[PDB]
Amino acid sequence: GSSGSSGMAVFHDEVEIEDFQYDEDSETYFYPCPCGDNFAITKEDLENGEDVATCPSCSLIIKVIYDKDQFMCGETVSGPSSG
Ligand SMILES: [Zn+2]
């Protein structure tokens, strides 16, 4: 019948990107998973406002604490001629 809520936000731990390991090679961050495989989150995903790293093993999801301003600042349209 009426299911209601669809899905449940269950994270393992909120880690700051500062701890993650950015790899220019594939512009993708990494993190040590308590299961085995190291998490992975494409820089793009972050900019889009994801802040979630999935594991190719357990598929765990953690909260990536990063400066939204840092990622955001870049594509922001140009009006007053910022610079
Ligand atoms: Zn894992």
Curated annotation (Swiss-Prot):
What's the protein here called?
Diphthamide biosynthesis protein 3
Q: What family does this belong to?
A: Belongs to the DPH3 family.
- Share an example GO biological-process annotation for this protein: positive regulation of binding
GO MF annotation terms: electron transfer activity; ferrous iron binding; iron chaperone activity
Q: What tissues express this gene product?
A: Widely expressed with highest levels in heart, liver, kidney and testis.
Q: Which cofactor does it need?
A: Fe(2+)
Q: What happens when the gene is disrupted?
A: Embryonic lethal about 11.5 days after fertilization. Decreases metastasis in a mouse model of melanoma.
Q: What information about domains appears in the record's comments?
A: The DPH-type metal-binding (MB) domain can also bind zinc. However, iron is the physiological binding partner as zinc binding impairs the protein electron donor function.
Localization annotation: Cytoplasm; Nucleus
